[PDB]
């Protein structure tokens, strides 16, 4: 009952981290709108979970997002929390293999889609003293190899979270982000499957964490529910869900 | 029921943040041991809360802490979480007004008392795959005026949290800290009461936060319960409970 | 003679921070190419400084940047350092007053122009074991009010610096950024001139720093020369030139 | 001539990082006082370098430090910069192998010795608008394995730097720190020599840096000279000299 009577929109909610966050909010008593650009995962989740419904919506299409918000209000009467989870990590790319145009397209999903849904939802969040939760990445803060565009988009999301927190604090609307590290999702599986030795790449990923495993969507989901329902003095924070990967010295390559 | 069947020790649990953390864990289903060097607050809390009991213990006295741990095991059979909250902020002191000896004494409470209880408890935490929660401070990270010794002790606690997280991760024991900002407690009230204009000093404190108020012990308590009971992929993190005070530009004093 | 025999390109070098960085490198013995989209400041600087020359170039125009690099090599035979300083801060804008299209345009200057010149220059920097210096902002790290797009662009530049540092470290090319705080430049003057009380706005800006003044272009310039010429074990760092504005509590707005 | 006419005290100046910093300041035109508790390195450096002199002084002995300051003034007439470099890293120690008393002793050197010389020197630094430079460590910020006491002492030094910067900014005295990563010094050599496979331990240390080597005392020295002589808008900063070890994912140990 931690978030009973509340209404939550989760973008990219059809699989992976997004689906874990959907399940965490339903388990807390909330009604959830699943936004995804793909029908398959999200429609099945709608049938599985009483309290969850699916709305097809590509967050890079402004008119899809407008409809997403107006249907959430029409069907449920309020809006309390937006979770900006939709995003993509391209396959590893050397810097000279990137293009300005590929970079713009990635900014369009990972940064501007978050911006657009946040903007269209804030009027309703102000009425409910609701809150925004953005899913950034640890690599926005510490960097990552062969991912200059991805890393730059997540640096922007984390910084944007802090700016918007400042602007919305007079209106009682909190704005926070979660920076996951290696979480085991279908995207992680798909990227590993492209590599010469998928299993070695997955072993590498597990051991980047002092805890020796990757994280789960449910753990990101629990962090989200905490920010929504219990972190009433937290705004502009970056909550790390990484298993300790940012800690200590490692293998990154006498004087 | 989030932490039902679990056993928690909270130091400095007799008032303020500590008492808020006690109440949050009892509300989550846990049995709580209240450690304090003063009898008055903690003994009343024992009578108020079924599931909480009080043990007199000065965390700077190694034999007090040994007894604290051995009695917790004798009375309850396990130990799942230690919350190192006991600590002190001296009145504002200019750097030339401090002494090496006053600095050592403050290190004794704010740093070594945390170290000692953590050390004596870890054998039992390893058996339970338990966890450690240290209460540091935002000012360890950003600094504070007229508090060189205090600030240095909290910088040490935050760094120590990360080192210990590294060492204990192979054994499944998580180690995290919470860095509160301005929280309204009897210590805050006592320091304000020493100033020329107490009410102006309290107004200043409220407005250091974008949210325009100070935080509450219950909010620190909710953050603690989250780290204990739900943050299973978090270790070595610093969870900010500050109301946004670290964000943006302020008044800190053409080219 | 700290950077004698070296060749440096500075974007936005015609006034402000950029012109200060130009002067610092000429004073260190280097030959400098001044890139700017406006002729007036940069052409005068060319006549003033032996060792500096001016090339008209809009960093958002890919063919301008290609020509910038190919002329630097044709005229001087090598390229040792690129300083990505060109950028803009819009007037203060509430979040609901921003647009996706204005945000894209700002990303085009502050982020993609840096990306494009870095990309076209890296082949030559690899040959010289040269280095990249990006001019980000403190507000990328701590946020700023009424500047969601600006803040997001500088968060991206700081994160991008760390990713590129990773990728270029095997080739001996260092990549670092400087995050200035309030520096007194014609842009600062222009923004203050838009406000109801320009002088009060400038007083506010000075007092956001513990040092009680704003910074100077020459101080950013000295930091740049240090990174280029002497910081041979520094890569991926963010060098703060802020006067302490990120330190301590301030005025950002009982429990 | 960058620091000509200036007078600098360097603690632990007899070898390693300290000796590198001594040489960097002499090369910049300054007169340097070498403080060390051991005679051998520092006395030879006095004979080697015109402009450097040696004063035996254990920074944990308050009366040694008082004499250090009063002799610097008596012999040279002013004091412009203090570099708090003296410090120690114990051999790797598991947390249950540490003691409260060993922890206190390490705090005495790495933290309180810095505090004491800073305190006795500040009157003279105020007269000269001088500055303080503390040598902390990257591991204060990111943690390190088997070094809970060491890590906590450096967390304290970095935080103390920011607090003191705040307090001294009205008087025009800047206070900054350098956080080196793996630097190749006699202490590094001595610790490696204790390990089962010294050469493997040294290879590990080199590859913790994206740059693939350890740093040199001269590079820390150049960073020090920059902070003293050219970073007039920098206070309370932490200048990383680490070769990128804090960047990206590494080896720190499916969901
Ligand atoms: N997996 C990790 O290790 C990891 C780590 C850090 C951050 N993240 C972030 O977490 C988020 C989710 O990652 P994931 O691993 O679960 O990914 P995923 O690919 O497994 O699932 C992402 C979901 O978002 C949807 N989506 C993609 N583009 C969309 C669009 N334009 N409109 C609507 N929905 C869209 C997909 O259809 C999919 O259902 C992303 O923002 C990612 O950057 C992931
Ligand atoms: N109040 C704030 O704004 C704030 C902000 C940041 C951090 N903190 C930290 O939070 C913690 C609690 O602060 P608070 O404001 O509630 O303080 P408080 O003074 O109101 O209460 C602290 C409690 O700890 C007890 N205590 C003190 N010394 C002890 C010892 N040696 N052994 C056992 N118990 C001891 C006291 O008796 C008291 O019951 C401290 O570690 C403090 O540094 C507080
Ligand atoms: N002034 C500050 O307080 C401050 C603080 C933090 C960061 N910064 C950053 O420092 C940099 C310089 O700022 P400033 O205050 O000197 O600004 P400024 O406006 O005074 O000068 C910027 C220069 O860049 C040029 N420029 C703009 N767009 C360009 C383009 N497309 N191509 C080429 N040149 C272009 C302008 O013509 C001008 O000569 C910017 O990146 C800014 O974000 C400034
Ligand atoms: N070597 C590294 O990788 C590294 C990395 C990060 C930080 N550091 C820090 O750099 C500093 C210097 O380290 P180093 O590797 O050159 O060490 P080092 O052992 O090689 O030399 C340190 C010097 O300090 C002197 N010293 C020790 N105790 C003293 C005391 N009580 N009074 C006066 N002098 C004293 C020693 O006699 C010696 O000459 C230390 O503060 C250390 O924590 C070193
Ligand atoms: N270039 C070496 C190399 O094998 N890189 C690889 C290989 C496989 C991966 C699988 C998934 C992810 C991923 O999406 C990801 C990971 C961490 C993040 F913090 C984050 O935001 C995203 N990254 C991978 C990176
Ligand atoms: N020197 C100006 C001045 O009036 N300072 C003052 C005045 C009154 C205070 C009342 C309480 C506290 C306090 O305990 C505290 C605050 C914030 C922290 F992050 C933290 O760890 C502790 N600090 C105060 C600081
Ligand atoms: N919304 C209150 C309000 O008066 N804001 C204002 C008013 C005037 C300014 C003048 C200039 C700047 C500026 O360009 C700037 C400053 C700091 C940065 F770290 C940075 O990257 C850029 N910012 C200003 C911000
Ligand atoms: N426990 C594994 C293990 O072999 N650790 C080891 C082994 C050998 C070392 C040699 C020297 C140093 C050292 O003094 C040091 C290094 C980095 C720092 F940022 C810093 O402040 C200090 N640390 C070492 C750590
Ligand atoms: Na349903
Ligand atoms: Na009870
Ligand atoms: Na010229
Ligand atoms: Na000499």
Give me the sheet containing B81-84, strands edge to edge: B52-56, B31-36, B7-11, B81-84, B131-135, B174-180, B238-241
C250: left (phi over 0), alpha (psi -120 to 50) or beta: beta
Method: X-ray
Cβ atoms D245, A252 nearer than 8 A: yes
User: Which has the closest alpha carbon to C144: C81, C108, C196, C191?
Assistant: C191
Structure tokens at B246: 């670290």
Q: What share of chain B is helix, strand, coil (3-state, %, to 5)?
A: 50, 15, 35
Phi-psi region of D243 (alpha: psi -120 to 50; beta: other; left: phi over 0): left
The secondary element (H helix, E strand) that includes residue C204 is helix C198-207
Comparing alpha-carbon positions, the chain A residue that sits nearest to D142 is A247
H, E, C per residue of D150-217: HHHHHHHHHHHHHHHHHHHHHHCCEEEEEEECCECCHHHHHHHHCCCCHHHHHHHHHHCCCCCCCECH
Which residues are CB-contacts of C183 (< 8 A; sequence separation ≥ 6)?
Answer: B255, C16, C17, C214, C215, C216, C217, C219, C220, C241
Inter-helix orientation angle B148-168/B100-107, to 10°: 40
Q: Residues of C63-80 as b/e, b for ≥16 C-beta within 10 angstroms?
A: ebbeebbeebeeebeebb
Q: What's the farthest any 2 CA atoms get from each other in chain B?
A: 67
Residue D250 corresponds to which tokens in the numbers above? 């590494």
Is there a contact between D200 and D226 (Cβ–Cβ < 8 Å)? no
Q: Indicate the pairing of strand C131-135 with strand D238-241.
A: unpaired
For residue D207, the CA-to-ligand 12 centroid distance in Å is 37
Residues from chain B that touch D236, judged by Cβ atoms under 8 A, are 143
- CB count within 10 Å of CB B186 equals 12
Which subunits have 3 or more CB–CB pairs within 8 Å of chain C?
Answer: A, B, D
Neighboring chain C residues of D233 at a CB cutoff of 8 Å: 211, 215-216, 219, 241-243
Taking alpha carbons only, the member of C200, C201, C177 closest to residue C188 is: C201
Burial of A101 (0-12, 13-18, 19+ CB in 10 A): exposed
Active site residue B171: no
Query: Would you call C23 exposed, middle or buried from its count of C-beta atoms within 10 A (0-12, 13-18, 19+)?
Result: buried
Tokens of C162: 């760390």
Cβ neighbours of residue C60 under 8 Å, at least 6 residues apart?
C108, C109, C112, C113
CA distance D145 to B165: 9
- Give dist(CA B108, CA B103) in Å, integer: 9
Q: Cβ contacts of residue D225 below 8 Å, gap of 6+?
A: D2, D3, D24, D25, D28
Among residues A3, A150, A171, A249, which one is catalytic? A150
Choose which residue among B56, B147, B185 to substitute to test ligand 2 binding: the one with the highest number of ligand atoms within 8 A of its C-beta: B185
Whole-angstrom distance, CA of residue D4 vs CA of residue D29: 4
Q: Which of B210, B223, B233 lies closest to A241 in CB terms? A: B233
Query: Across chain A, how many H-helices and E-strands are there?
Result: 10, 7
- Angle, helices C114-128 vs C62-76, to 10°: value is 20
Question: If we measure between CA atoms, which residue out of C115, C127, C130 comes closest to residue C30?
Answer: C130
Q: What is the three-class DSSP state of C82?
A: strand
Element (H, E) at C115: helix C114-128
How many other C-beta atoms lie within 10 A of the C-beta of residue C167? Answer: 23
Class of domain A1-255: alpha beta
> Any CB–CB contact under 8 A between C198 and chain B?
no
Q: How far apart are CA B167 and CA D96, in angstroms?
A: 10
Produce one character per residue of D134-169: b if its CB has 16 or more CB atoms within 10 Å, e if not.
Answer: bbbbbbbbbbbbbbbbbbbbbbbbbbbbbbbbbbbb
Structure tokens, C174: 């260092």
Residues 6+ apart with CB under 8 A from B70: none
- Residue from C115, C124, C150, C171 carrying the catalytic annotation: C150
Residue with tokens 């040294």: D202
Q: Look at residues B70, B85, B87 and name the one whose alpha carbon lies nearest to residue B34.
A: B85
Q: Are C216 and C241 in contact (CB under 8 A)?
A: no
Q: For testing the chain C interface, which of D233, D241, D248 should be mutated: the one with the most C CBs within 10 Å? A: D233
Q: DSSP H helical segments within chain B, as ranges?
A: 16-27, 39-48, 62-76, 100-107, 114-128, 139-142, 148-168, 186-193, 198-207, 217-229
Are residues B239 and A239 in contact, defined by beta-carbon separation less than 8 angstroms? yes
Q: What are phi and psi of A41, to 5 degrees?
A: -65, -50
Phi/psi at B97 (5° precision): -90, -5
Nearest in space to A105 (alpha carbons), one of A63, A153, A144 = A153
According to DSSP H, which parts of chain A are helical?
A: 16-27, 39-48, 62-76, 100-107, 114-128, 139-142, 148-168, 186-193, 198-207, 217-229
The token duo for D98 is 């540490």
Q: Whose CA is nearest to atom 15 of ligand 8?
A: D182
Residue B135 · residue B220 · CB < 8 Å:
yes
Distance CA A79, CA C17 (A): 45
B151 lines ligand 6 (CB under 6 A): no
Q: Which residues surround ligand 12, an ion (CB under 5 A)?
A: D 46, 49, 52
Number of other residues whose CB lies within 10 A of the CB of residue B180:
24
Question: Among the residues of chain D, which ranges form H helices?
Answer: 16-27, 39-48, 62-76, 100-107, 114-128, 139-142, 148-168, 186-193, 198-207, 217-229
- CB-hemisphere CA count at 13 Å for D211? 26
Give CA angle at A208 (A207, A213), nearest 5°: 50
Give me the residue spans of the domains in chain B: 1-255
CB contact under 8 A, A166 and B222: no
The C-alpha atoms of residue C54 and residue D232 are separated, in whole angstroms, by: 29
User: Which residue, A128, A4, A107, A99, is CA-closest to A59?
Assistant: A107
Q: Which two tokens stand for residue A226?
A: 């905490």
Nearest by CB to A244, from B230, B236, B248: name it.
B236
Using alpha carbons only, how large is chain C's radius of gyration in Å? 18
Catalytic residue among B115, B150, B171, B249: B150
| Structural contact between residues A241 and A223, judged by C-beta atoms closer than 8 angstroms | yes
Look at chain D and count its residues: 255
Size of the B and D interface in Cβ pairs below 8 Å: 132
Identify which of C119, C126, C246, C118 has the alpha carbon closest to the alpha carbon of residue C177.
C118
- Two structure tokens written together for A229: 């329902």
| Cross-strand bridge partners of residue D241 | D180
Distance CA C187, CA C184 (A): 8
């Amino acid at each position: 009952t931690r978030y009973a009577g509340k209404v939550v929109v989760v973008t990219g909610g059809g699989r992976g981290i997004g689906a874990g966050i959907v399940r965490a909010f339903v388990n807390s008593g909330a009604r959830v709108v699943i936004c995804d650009k793909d029908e398959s995962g999200g429609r099945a989740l709608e049938q599985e979970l009483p309290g969850a419904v699916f709305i097809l919506c590509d967050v890079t299409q402004e008119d899809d997002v407008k409809t997403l918000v107006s249907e959430t209000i029409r069907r449920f009467g309020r809006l309390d929390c937006v979770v900006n989870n939709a995003g993509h990590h391209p396959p590893p790319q050397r810097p000279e293999e990137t293009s300005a145009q590929g970079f713009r397209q990635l900014l369009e999903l990972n940064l501007l889609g978050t911006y657009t849904l946040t903007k269209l939802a804030l009027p309703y969040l102000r009425k409910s003293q609701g809150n925004v939760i953005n899913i950034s990445s640890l690599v926005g803060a510490i960097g990552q190899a062969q991912a200059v565009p991805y890393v730059a988009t997540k640096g922007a999301v984390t910084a944007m979270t802090k700016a918007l927190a400042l602007d919305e604090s007079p209106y009682g609307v909190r704005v926070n982000c979660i920076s996951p590290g290696n979480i085991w999702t279908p995207l992680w599986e798909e990227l590993a499957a492209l590599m010469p030795d998928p299993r070695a790449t997955i072993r590498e990923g597990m051991l980047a964490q002092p805890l020796g495993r990757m994280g789960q969507p449910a753990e990101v989901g629990a962090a989200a529910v905490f920010l929504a329902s219990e972190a009433n003095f937290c705004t502009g924070i970056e909550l790390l869900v990484t298993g300790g990967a940012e800690l200590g010295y490692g293998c990154k390559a006498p004087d």
